[PDB]
Design an enzyme around this catalytic site. Structure first.
Site, mmCIF file in Angstrom:
data_model
loop_
_atom_site.group_PDB
_atom_site.id
_atom_site.type_symbol
_atom_site.label_atom_id
_atom_site.label_comp_id
_atom_site.label_asym_id
_atom_site.label_seq_id
_atom_site.Cartn_x
_atom_site.Cartn_y
_atom_site.Cartn_z
ATOM 1 N N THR G 1 0.471 -1.322 -0.083
ATOM 2 C CA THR G 1 0.324 -0.205 -0.480
ATOM 3 C C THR G 1 0.987 1.706 0.330
ATOM 4 O O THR G 1 1.844 1.101 -0.106
ATOM 5 C CB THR G 1 -0.824 -0.153 0.931
ATOM 6 O OG1 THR G 1 0.143 0.631 2.438
ATOM 7 C CG2 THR G 1 -2.065 -1.593 1.157
ATOM 8 N N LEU G 2 0.290 2.389 0.097
ATOM 9 C CA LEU G 2 0.610 4.070 -0.096
ATOM 10 C C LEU G 2 0.335 4.979 0.797
ATOM 11 O O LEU G 2 -0.914 4.977 0.433
ATOM 12 C CB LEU G 2 1.271 4.124 -1.685
ATOM 13 C CG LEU G 2 2.087 5.259 -1.460
ATOM 14 C CD1 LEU G 2 3.626 4.862 -2.741
ATOM 15 C CD2 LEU G 2 1.650 6.627 -2.030
ATOM 16 N N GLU G 56 -3.274 1.862 9.625
ATOM 17 C CA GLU G 56 -3.812 1.962 8.551
ATOM 18 C C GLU G 56 -4.571 0.668 8.691
ATOM 19 O O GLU G 56 -4.116 -0.363 9.069
ATOM 20 C CB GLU G 56 -3.039 2.245 7.479
ATOM 21 C CG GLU G 56 -4.306 1.359 6.397
ATOM 22 C CD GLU G 56 -3.531 2.056 4.973
ATOM 23 O OE1 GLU G 56 -2.930 3.236 4.736
ATOM 24 O OE2 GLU G 56 -3.816 0.975 4.255
ATOM 25 N N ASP G 59 -4.229 -1.961 5.856
ATOM 26 C CA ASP G 59 -3.536 -3.038 6.263
ATOM 27 C C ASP G 59 -3.388 -3.583 7.418
ATOM 28 O O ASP G 59 -2.166 -4.248 7.764
ATOM 29 C CB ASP G 59 -1.961 -2.082 6.746
ATOM 30 C CG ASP G 59 -0.873 -2.587 4.596
ATOM 31 O OD1 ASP G 59 -1.748 -3.045 4.462
ATOM 32 O OD2 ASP G 59 -0.597 -1.293 4.484
ATOM 33 N N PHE G 109 1.870 0.004 7.253
ATOM 34 C CA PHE G 109 1.778 0.860 8.020
ATOM 35 C C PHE G 109 1.194 0.405 9.412
ATOM 36 O O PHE G 109 0.161 0.879 9.083
ATOM 37 C CB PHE G 109 1.322 2.261 7.892
ATOM 38 C CG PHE G 109 2.133 2.680 6.588
ATOM 39 C CD1 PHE G 109 3.400 3.161 6.618
ATOM 40 C CD2 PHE G 109 1.919 2.562 5.321
ATOM 41 C CE1 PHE G 109 3.808 3.975 5.193
ATOM 42 C CE2 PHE G 109 2.668 2.992 4.370
ATOM 43 C CZ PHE G 109 3.484 3.463 4.442
#
Lengths: 246, 233, 224, 240, 236, 227, 224, 227
Positions: G1-2, G56, G59, G109
């Site tokens: 992810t980002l 997050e 995640d 994260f």
């Protein structure tokens, strides 16, 4: 003597594949029959519900497997080979949607199955799949379609066909049963094909199997228009159609 | 003329030899048993291998496995080859749990295990499996169901089934009493009476019941309920 | 693994040729304004619908094919035949030439002889069609070789079936006149005298696209 | 057994049967003249229903200056021609010049040698007279076998009845041979090999290179060899 | 048609129902030397008898080491036993690296028995003909063993092929080892098994019987070359 | 008779393809190595019957490394493949760990390559060195059995040299003590005379921890002591 | 992810004599606003250990499913009560999952806190996966571990992740005592999260307090 | 390829016998050169150069005259010439004859140990230069063994020609004297035809052939020496 039938990809002196020929005898040895017949805007498959030769739940044992919600099919022969053939068909028919958007056609499904079957014939990878079946289903043309495939590659297709151990004692009976509706009365089509084709289908099975054909040992399915679902006809309707012979 | 060598060779009669010998292989191994009850699905497993070792622990050789808290699995045959199917069974549950966040149902697991056993039969180089698998569960709303997987697929739903070295013996004992509506606490005492008919007073029969309204999850043998065995009647 | 033999001939290929020597008779005859093909469709009963089971399939809008062997193999070679009629049509915008097409299918059949653990194809093909260099009628052998025939048969008992063509054929025959000399090579050749819409006939139809003649169309020629 | 195994005599089995399998195939004649190399052929006639006017499967084309006359399994011949055409073109794509035949037979006999050494596959029942013209050493005519032991020549007669037809070239061949005299020389050995006195002309095919600084490489029609056949009648360069 | 067709292949099954190729491996472990282990309440001792092939030779090792609390003792062929040792060493050491707790004993043998299973269905690879003997202690000292086919048996005493029948009978009537908490009586009881099951008129234990102990405050301590002949190899 | 497969067993619990190579190692040249308290001394023959040979290109005592020397027997064409492999892993060990490899860790890897399940390597070695813990001498077989030997012999005449060492080996023997002993066993089983060319002894001393091939000049002073 | 698109708040793990106390609110903010206000973050992973989030929330499923699966696999081999996966194993395994992701660039994260009872002296040899008095623990059988998104891992007596590290930990580093009572622990967190209601921009009510004792994994829901 | 019940290899001994049915080839070492010799046969009035069937080059200083299967040398030479040039690219030195022979022997050994691969039915002999100004003629067999020689011969009836060479082999010879010794090896082809023997004089790191003109001046002297 040690004849030429050891491997599957080795021809005989006369030119016959005996591994395929023996695989067809595996279906004739399971003593399980099934009748399939297509009439006007409909087609049905009649199972037999018998163990492939106590406490067995008879609602579970069957010889009818829906590949999709539109294309159903039957299976005979060895129980192990017939189960894997459905999975090699469900994963293929659903793959047609993901790769082509439209729902798979009944005639394209059988030809795509035979393509994978022919590959296992020329190569000595695996054993042949000792099974057979009648692929049923209507198409976009609003016409019913029926197709039978042998252990070898075949996309014959019949308006009425028998699969199982009694294919050598049924063509003389199915031809008469089909003639009992084609060149006979043939008045109209009042969308009562169930009372016209299935009644002239269960009667064909009774002429093949000399038993009394108990309703709790037979299950049919229709893929006619206005239904389009490969619905297994309930027990009460099966026993009701059995009394129509009188 | 010797056509039962490989698994891909079909007999001229039409039968599939080299796979029918496996039934003669599971007919010489120890037996397993299971049956439907109105309160759960009691299982059973007799390990008739007492005359040679006599040094193993009492409750060590267990042949009852579960993929999760509500589906039991037993063996009948080569104990080594059955380990590979349990690994494919638990992995099938875990793969189904990742992709669907729920417990794997019974009618979709049995159809995936039978495919795994049947897949090794088709190969010309891999030998077929030699273990018959009993898969059962007990729903809360619906009643239980026992699926029997023998070699060369053939998944069949049962209501009571025995496989092992006395399958033609214990089958006649189950049809006498209608076990479909009795209990689990009384059938366990009836099961121990059957084993005495067909061979000593030993605690080599380890077995558990999936449901006794004990949160409807797979329990253990619960030794205290097994020790008051009616050893005479 | 279809190895050699001390006599200097493949034994699996010779066995494969016996299979095409005992199947339904296929027959193709070229003309000066098109090529014709025919096949004795052995109808076993009235259950098999004629529009499903066929012996004449298409490769493109100008290439016709005929089968003469293992019916299960009547589709796998067709799939790679149509695929080659597309791979040539993608790069080259024109139509696929018959000599360019038959040399690829002959190469595909060849690779099923030298590869280990495979079985040779149990069929004989008859590729025909209109080309920019005239007409053509090739025949593919299970061994892998191909012949540039003019009029030939490949089915059962072709040693005497070709004898009708060796004496009842001229170099300049029209396509309409060649139909009756082809029907004579089927009805008057052997059993199957009840030829009543039980013969599939494809034609090049004088440079037009490939036309599969219908049952009632052949009935006009079946009266003689 | 398989081709991988040897024999106690030291020879092989699969490559030995292939050497005999080409002996039951039609004959082909090779001939180097002082103007260009020429080749011969023998169209085996299964029947009279072949085209017999547009094609012939005994002499093919490798490049615009290299051509071979095949003899053996007609089915397996098409693979090597489809394999030699790539090497004759991959050399042009890698060196921007024509490929010498001495560097072509080495590139093609290795594909045969690679089959009689591993893979467990059958060898190539094919052997052909491949010739061409090059700037390094003029006209050449090589000859491959199913084992790969190629060798240069002046005249070769593989196919059926080799020992008889090759003996004809031991005496009737000369060091200086013109194009027309070479054709008549190769025409008799092509006819007497089939135990006949005159070719039916609905038979044998011939080819010739004769580089006129552009490597014309013309083939022959059924009418062009009629004049050659007629010249054999008057001037008979007999069996001997 | 029998006795020679269903014998050389790991794929074919006998018509009776016995995989005769794998069954030869179970008998192949009987040609090796003897071994015996005793499971006490808190300790496990393994007695292994080496085999001096020649006078100039040295006795090849029998008892090995896998971890601090895990040590095996092969009995069979040294070819496949060494391969399973490396597979068991790389497996248990990875457990102390990927995590920090020690590897569970039954969860270790499940991986080792699975290694036999992977070399049983493939036609190319044969079966490991070697009778393993895993002796370890994690929370209760347990003793496991395998066969060519995948198996586990939480044994309390064992034997391995040389004079196993003479040794199994001694352990069948000696079931007081559980209360023989004193390590000295345990090692004398374990060595008495070999002394009453050795070959006829052979040397009893002339420093050629490997001994290893493992327990609560005991890692896989190999019995030194001096503690055994002082009183243990001198009582009989 | 079961000889088709390579991995087939026996009803008596034995291998078959490995046992075929057990007799193949009894056809090479004889060799003998003695492990003394001060080092390891090796010995071998030199079948250079045809005088046209260079006499130096053919050797029976190659070197695994500078600290480990070994002998050869059986198939000389396959013996070089294992020695070339041992010359890689022993040298690869020096690149990872700065100390020299141990023979117990080297013979175990020279035996695992004879477990290709091709074909088993029909070769027996006499790997010796002074790596650590004094000098050690090992003898491997195609079956994979690695038995540490104090004094052994491999070759076509290994049977006669076996009983000779049993009646001659003493634990308190120095280098010069065993050097004559490494030749008296060769004087017995020899179809020639112990000249200065047929014998190719070499030793690894514990002091320098390296091997040194005894040349033609040094062996002349040892073959003339007449044991 | 980002990028932490759907973040979470911070949890607080404190140990005492009867067990492990954990707390977390139900606010799942979408960056600048409270999108979801009824999500769960204290996740049950065993009958004796639990784990919390921060970071997050998206995640976390790639970590929750990869952790609850291991519990069922371990439960299927429960041949003894000591074979249950101790919290030391789960915390060391989670750190390995983050370390292998750190070798790549995607770090997932999260700042996972793993707490549980690291002992087997309290009978629980029967698991009820699908749904009297307490005990006193010696403070060494209670494992509470922290795992950073960079892979930093350790264990201590009181851990606080996310944004409350600068607020909760300060008030809790000097007010924490040994062997705190049950009413002392909940009154310590109640007065602590109050500070995290007027300063943290992304926090709310619905403190899902979860206690892990020697008898089970309970659940409670106050509102301050 | 598997073993034999006694200990031999049926796939290697068959291949080693396959080289016996091939053209003979003899090599001979000297002081600072090494003349080679080979005896072939060709059909008259056809096959002009025999495509240089023997005396193949590998580098500027490494000749090679194989014997045996003529078609199996192309794959052996092409897998050698590539390695002879690859060594020059990685070590920046022209490949010594010690490395080429150690590579050709490893090529044949890599073909018998592996399964499903026919062994190289070809025995060769390589004559080149070492790193120092030296010349050592090697000789490899299909089994994989290799050894240097001062003179060697392989091919049809190589024993009777190697035996003759074992007697009158002097130590250092003259360029014409060394040729006469190699030209005294026509003990394989009857009548000593000049159109059958081919010799090359490998000297001063530059290979060159020998014209048929000086061949007749030396091949005719042998007939006037038997009386």
């Amino acid at each position: 003597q040690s004849m030429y039938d050891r491997h599957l990809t080795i021809f005989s002196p006369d030119g016959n594949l005996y591994q395929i020929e023996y695989a067809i005898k595996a279906v004739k040895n399971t003593n399980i029959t099934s009748v399939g017949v297509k009439g006007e805007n409909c087609a049905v498959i009649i199972s037999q519900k018998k163990m492939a030769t106590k406490l067995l739940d008879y609602n579970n044992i069957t010889n009818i497997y829906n590949i999709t919600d539109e294309i159903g099919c039957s299976m005979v022969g060895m129980p192990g080979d017939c189960l894997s053939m459905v999975y090699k068909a469900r994963s293929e028919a659903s793959e047609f949607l993901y790769s082509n958007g439209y729902n798979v056609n009944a005639e394209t499904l059988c030809r795509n199955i035979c393509d994978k079957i022919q590959v296992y014939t020329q190569h000595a990878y695996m054993r042949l799949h000792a099974c057979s079946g009648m692929i049923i289903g209507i198409d976009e043309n609003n016409k019913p379609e029926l197709f039978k495939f042998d252990p070898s590659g075949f996309c014959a297709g019949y308006r009425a066909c028998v699969i199982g151990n009694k294919e050598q004692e049924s063509i003389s009976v199915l031809e008469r049963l089909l003639e009992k509706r084609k060149k006979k009365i043939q008045q109209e089509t009042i969308d009562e094909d169930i009372r016209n084709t299935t009644i002239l289908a269960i009667e064909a099975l009774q002429t093949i199997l000399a038993f009394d054909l108990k309703a709790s040992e037979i299950e049919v399915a229709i893929v006619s228009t206005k239904n389009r679902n490969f619905t297994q006809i309930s027990e009460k309707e099966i026993d009701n159609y059995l009394t129509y012979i009188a | 003329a010797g056509y039962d060598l490989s698994v891909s060779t079909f007999s001229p009669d039409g039968r599939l030899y080299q796979v029918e010998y496996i039934y003669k292989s599971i007919n010489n191994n120890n037996t397993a048993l299971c049956l439907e009850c109105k309160d759960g699905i009691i299982c059973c497993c007799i390990n008739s291998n007492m005359d040679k070792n006599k040094m193993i622990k009492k409750n060590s050789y267990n042949r009852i496995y579960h993929v999760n808290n509500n589906i039991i699995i037993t063996y009948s045959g080569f104990d080594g080859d059955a380990r590979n199917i349990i690994d494919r069974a638990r992995s099938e549950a875990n793969t189904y749990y990742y992709n669907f966040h729920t417990n794997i149902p019974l009618h979709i697991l049995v159809n995936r295990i039978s495919l795994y056993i049947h897949a090794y039969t088709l190969y010309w180089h891999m030998r077929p499996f030699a273990a018959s698998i009993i898969i059962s569960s007990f729903n809360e709303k619906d009643k239980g169901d026992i699926y029997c997987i023998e070699p060369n697929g053939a998944c069949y739903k049962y209501s009571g089934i025995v496989i092992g070295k006395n399958k033609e013996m214990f089958k006649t004992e189950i049809e006498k009493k209608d076990y479909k509506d009795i209990n689990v606490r009384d059938a366990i005492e009836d099961i121990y009476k059957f084993i005495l008919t067909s061979n000593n007073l030993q605690n080599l029969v380890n077995f558990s019941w999936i449901c006794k309204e004990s949160s409807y999850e797979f329990q253990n043998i619960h030794e205290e309920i097994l020790t008051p065995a009616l050893n005479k009647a | 693994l279809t190895t050699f033999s001390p006599t200097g001939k493949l034994v699996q290929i010779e066995y494969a040729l016996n299979r095409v020597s005992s199947s339904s008779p296929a027959l193709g005859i070229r003309a000066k304004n098109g090529v014709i093909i025919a096949t004795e469709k052995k109808s076993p009963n009235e259950l098999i619908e004629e529009n499903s089971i066929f012996k004449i399939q298409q490769i493109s809008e100008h290439i016709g094919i005929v089968y003469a062997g293992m019916p299960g193999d009547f589709r796998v070679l067709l799939k790679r035949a149509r695929k080659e009629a597309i791979r040539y049509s993608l790069q080259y915008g024109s139509e696929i030439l018959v000599k360019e097409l038959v040399k690829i299918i002959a190469s595909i059949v060849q690779e099923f002889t030298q590869t280990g653990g495979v079985r040779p194809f149990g069929l004989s093909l008859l590729i025909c069609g209109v080309d920019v260099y005239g007409y053509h009628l090739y025949q593919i052998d299970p061994s892998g070789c191909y012949f540039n025939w003019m009029a030939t048969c490949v089915g059962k008992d072709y040693q005497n079936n070709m004898s009708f063509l060796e004496k009842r054929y001229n170099k300049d025959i029209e396509i309409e006149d060649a139909i009756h000399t082809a029907i004579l090579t089927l009805k008057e050749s052997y059993e199957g005298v009840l030829n009543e819409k039980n013969i599939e006939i494809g034609v090049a139809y004088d440079n037009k696209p490939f036309k599969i003649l219908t049952q009632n169309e052949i009935k006009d020629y079946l009266i003689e | 057994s398989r081709t991988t195994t040897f024999s106690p005599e030291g020879r092989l089995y699969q490559v030995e049967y292939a050497l005999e399998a080409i002996n039951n195939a039609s004959i082909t004649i090779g001939l180097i003249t002082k103007d260009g190399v020429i080749l011969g052929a023998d169209k085996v006639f299964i029947s009279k229903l072949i085209d017999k006017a547009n094609n012939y499967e005994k002499i093919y084309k490798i490049d615009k200056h290299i051509f071979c006359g095949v003899a053996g399994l007609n089915a397996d011949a098409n693979i090597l021609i489809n394999q030699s055409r790539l090497y004759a073109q991959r050399y042009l794509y890698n060196y921007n010049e024509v490929q010498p035949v001495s560097q072509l037979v080495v590139q093609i006999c290795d594909i045969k040698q690679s089959y009689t050494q591993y893979g467990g596959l059958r060898p190539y029942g094919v052997s052909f007279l491949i010739g061409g013209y090059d700037t390094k050493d003029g006209y050449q005519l090589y000859h491959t076998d199913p084992s790969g032991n190629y060798s240069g020549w002046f005249a070769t007669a593989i196919g059926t009845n080799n020992l008889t037809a090759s003996s004809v070239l031991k005496q009737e061949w000369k060091n200086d041979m013109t194009l027309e005299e070479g054709l008549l020389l190769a025409l008799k050995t092509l006819a007497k090999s089939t135990d006949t006195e005159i070719p039916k002309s609905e038979k044998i095919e011939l080819a010739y290179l004769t580089n006129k600084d552009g490597e014309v490489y013309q083939k022959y029609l059924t009418e062009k060899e009629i004049e050659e056949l007629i010249k054999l009648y008057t001037q008979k360069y007999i069996k001997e | 048609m029998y006795r020679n067709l269903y014998d050389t292949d790991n794929i074919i099954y006998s018509p009776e129902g016995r995989l005769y190729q794998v069954e030869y491996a179970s008998e192949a472990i009987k040609q090796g030397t003897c071994a015996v282990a005793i499971k006490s309440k808190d300790y496990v001792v393994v007695s292994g008898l080496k085999k001096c092939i020649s006078k100039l030779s040295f006795p090849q090792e029998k008892i090995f080491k896998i971890d601090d609390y895990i040590g095996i003792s092969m009995s069979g062929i040294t070819s496949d036993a060494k391969v399973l040792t490396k597979f068991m060493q790389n497996e248990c050491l990875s457990h102390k690296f990927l995590y920090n707790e020690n590897i569970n004993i039954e969860s270790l043998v499940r991986s080792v028995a699975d290694k036999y299973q992977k070399n049983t269905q493939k036609s190319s690879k044969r079966a490991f003909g070697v009778g393993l003997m895993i002796a370890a202690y994690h929370n209760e000292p347990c003793i496991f063993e395998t066969r060519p086919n995948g198996s586990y048996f939480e044994y309390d005493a064992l034997s391995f092929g040389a004079r196993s029948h003479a040794s199994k009978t001694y352990l069948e009537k000696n079931l007081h080892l559980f209360e023989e908490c004193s390590l000295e009586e345990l090692i004398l009881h374990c060595l008495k098994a070999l002394k009453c099951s050795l070959s006829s008129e052979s040397e009893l234990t002339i420093s050629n019987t490997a001994l290893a102990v493992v327990g609560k405050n005991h890692p896989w301590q190999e019995i030194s070359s001096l503690q055994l002949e002082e009183y243990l190899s001198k009582v009989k | 008779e079961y000889d088709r497969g390579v991995n087939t067993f026996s009803p008596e619990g034995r291998l078959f393809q490995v046992e075929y190579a057990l007799g193949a190692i009894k056809l090479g040249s004889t060799a003998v190595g003695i492990c003394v308290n001060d080092g390891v001394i090796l010995a071998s023959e030199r079948r250079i019957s045809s005088t046209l040979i260079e006499k130096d290109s053919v050797e029976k005592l190659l070197s695994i490394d500078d600290h480990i020397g070994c002998a050869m027997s059986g198939l000389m064409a396959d013996a070089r493949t294992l020695i070339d492999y041992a010359r890689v892993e022993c040298n690869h060990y020096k690149f990872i760990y700065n100390e020299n490899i141990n023979i117990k860790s080297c013979v175990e890897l020279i035996s695992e390559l004879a477990l290709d399940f091709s074909r088993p390597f029909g070769v027996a070695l006499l790997i010796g060195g002074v790596d650590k813990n004094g000098p050690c001498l090992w003898y491997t077989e195609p079956s994979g059995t690695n038995t540490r030997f104090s004094a052994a012999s491999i070759g076509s005449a290994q049977e006669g040299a076996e009983l000779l060492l049993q009646e001659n080996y003493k634990k308190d023997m120095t280098f010069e003590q065993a050097e004559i002993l490494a030749l008296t066993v060769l004087r017995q089983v020899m179809e020639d005379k112990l000249s200065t060319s047929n014998v190719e002894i070499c030793a690894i001393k514990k002091s320098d921890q390296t091997f040194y091939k005894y040349n033609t000049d040094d062996i002349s002073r040892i073959i003339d002591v007449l044991p | 992810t980002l990028g932490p698109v759907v973040t979470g708040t911070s949890v607080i793990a404190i140990k005492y004599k009867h067990g492990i106390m954990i707390a977390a609110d139900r606010k799942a903010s979408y960056g600048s606003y409270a999108k979801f206000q009824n999500v769960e973050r204290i996740f049950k992973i065993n009958n004796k250990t639990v784990m919390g989030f921060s970071g997050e929330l998206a995640d976390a499923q790639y970590l929750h499913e990869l952790l609850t699966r291991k519990n069922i696999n371990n439960l299927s081999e429960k041949k003894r009560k000591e074979d249950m996966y101790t919290p030391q194993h789960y915390h060391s395994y989670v750190s390995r999952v983050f370390y292998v992701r750190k070798n790549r660039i995607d770090p997932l994260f999260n700042n996972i806190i793993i707490a549980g009872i690291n002992s087997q002296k309290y009978d629980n040899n029967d698991d009820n996966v699908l749904l009297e008095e307490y005990k006193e623990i010696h403070k060494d059988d209670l494992y509470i571990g922290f795992v950073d998104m960079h892979g930093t891992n350790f264990c201590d007596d009181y851990i606080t992740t996310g944004y409350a590290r600068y607020f909760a930990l300060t008030l809790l580093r000097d007010h924490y005592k040994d062997n705190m009572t049950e009413e002392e622990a909940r009154i310590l967190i109640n007065e602590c999260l109050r500070i995290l209601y007027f300063r943290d921009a992304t926090s709310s009510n619905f403190i899902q307090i979860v206690k892990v004792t020697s008898k089970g994994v309970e659940y409670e829901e106050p509102y301050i | 390829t598997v073993f034999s019940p006694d200990g031999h290899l049926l796939q290697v001994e068959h291949a080693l016998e396959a080289v016996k049915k091939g053209g003979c080839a003899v090599a001979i070492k000297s002081s600072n050169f090494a003349v080679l010799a080979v005896e072939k046969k060709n059909i008259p009035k056809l096959q002009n150069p025999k495509t240089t069937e023997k005396l193949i080059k590998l580098d500027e200083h490494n000749c090679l005259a194989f014997a045996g299967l003529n078609a199996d040398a192309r794959v052996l030479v092409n897998k050698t010439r590539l390695e002879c040039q690859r060594y020059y690219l990685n070590m920046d030195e022209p490949a010594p004859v010690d490395y080429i022979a150690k590579y050709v022997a490893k090529v044949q050994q890599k073909f018998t140990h592996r399964g499903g691969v026919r062994p190289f039915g070809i025995a060769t002999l390589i004559a080149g230069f070492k790193n120092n100004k030296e010349i050592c003629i090697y000789q490899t067999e299909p089994s994989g063994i290799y050894a240097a020689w001062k003179a060697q011969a392989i091919g049809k009836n190589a024993k009777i020609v190697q035996e003759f060479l074992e007697k009158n082999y002097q130590e250092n010879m003259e360029q014409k004297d060394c040729i006469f010794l190699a030209l005294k090896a026509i003990f394989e082809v009857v009548e000593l035809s000049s159109k059958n023997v081919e010799v090359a004089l490998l000297t001063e790191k530059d290979l060159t052939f020998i014209e048929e003109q000086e061949i007749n001046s030396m091949v005719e002297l042998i007939d006037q020496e038997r009386t």
